[PDB]
Design a protein around this ligand. Structure first.
Ligand SMILES: [Ca+2]
Ligand SMILES: [Ca+2]
Lengths: 101, 138, 71
């Protein structure tokens, strides 16, 4: 019981640095994607903004794809190296069988 | 462990043949239903032909409690190995062993550290590799 | 060789994921909402990119350990 709980708080010990990749993330997103300023844009300006944002969607998706492709190649390598490393009711039953007993 | 061990002994002594020592072959499936484990054909067969029956069909607890506590691995030990290996070099050295031992909270003498390392280190390089770790924790 | 197949595959996947922007019937209020929608898309893509970058770093660590174990 004590060992099980020990291997429990030694995670409790890492909740602590998950907890940091979250104020992290906060803010890489901070911009890379910054808030829209829409106040004072007229109709034409809004049409152009929508086209600008849509173009940005394309660019960001391409960048995401590139990182994803590297992650995919790492998976293939991890899978290969992983292969290589070791290479080198009683209740009801009792009532029925025994009855009152 | 005290809570589980006691509860396995409470169901065992209830479903007795001897008294307080050995229960019957059909009795093994009963006690498993009372605690929390379904006795399927594949489970009953492998429990049968691997962990033996003391007489004809009569199981005893020293061998019963070893198979019942673990059920109700190398992969598991591999993950734990990584936790010892703080510099990620694929070996557990004396410093890493020391750090882990102190983290246990038990009073750790120099003899505790030296003997555990000698116990683990089969090829006398002063560190515990992955294969040595598996034997060490067997 | 392998490079022009990786490139055409990339083009193909990105093409399949692309949405058609049709804004020509929208008024000013609808356009503001359309802009917010596109912004949210960019955000979500940036968030996914960030997760992948973090995964990549953990993978490099794992690969280094595996290589050491093998050696
Ligand atoms: Ca090490
Ligand atoms: Ca050794």
């Amino acid at each position: 019981q004590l060992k099980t709980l020990m291997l429990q708080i030694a995670k409790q010990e890492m909740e602590r640095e998950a907890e940091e990749r979250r104020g992290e993330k906060g803010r890489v997103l901070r911009t890379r994607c910054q808030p829209l300023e829409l106040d004072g844009l007229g109709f034409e300006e809004l049409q152009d903004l929508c086209r600008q944002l849509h173009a940005r969607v394309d660019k960001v998706d391409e960048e995401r794809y590139d990182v994803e492709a590297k992650v995919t190649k790492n998976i293939t390598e991890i899978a290969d190296l992983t292969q290589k490393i070791y290479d080198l009711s009683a209740d009801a039953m009792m009532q029925a069988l025994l009855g009152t007993r | 462990t005290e809570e589980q061990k006691n509860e396995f002994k409470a169901a065992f002594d209830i479903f007795v043949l001897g008294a307080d020592g050995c229960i019957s072959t059909k009795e093994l499936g009963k006690v498993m239903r009372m605690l929390g484990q379904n006795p399927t054909p594949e489970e009953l067969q492998e429990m049968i032909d691997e962990v033996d029956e003391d007489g004809s069909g009569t199981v005893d607890f020293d061998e019963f409690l070893v198979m019942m506590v673990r059920c109700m691995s190398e992969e598991e030990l591999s993950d734990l190995f990584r936790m010892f290996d703080k510099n990620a070099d694929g070996y557990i050295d004396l410093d890493e062993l020391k750090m882990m031992l102190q983290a246990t909270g038990e009073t750790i003498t120099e003899d505790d550290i030296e003997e555990l390392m000698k116990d683990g280190d089969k090829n006398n390089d002063g560190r515990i590799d992955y294969d040595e770790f598996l034997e060490f924790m067997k | 060789g392998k490079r022009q197949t990786e490139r055409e595959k990339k083009k193909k996947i990105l093409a399949e994921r692309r949405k058609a922007l049709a804004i020509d019937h929208l008024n000013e209020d609808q356009l503001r909402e359309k802009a917010k929608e596109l912004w949210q898309s960019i955000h979500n893509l940036e968030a996914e990119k960030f997760d992948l970058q973090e995964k990549f770093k953990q993978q490099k660590y794992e690969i280094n350990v595996l290589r050491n174990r093998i050696n």
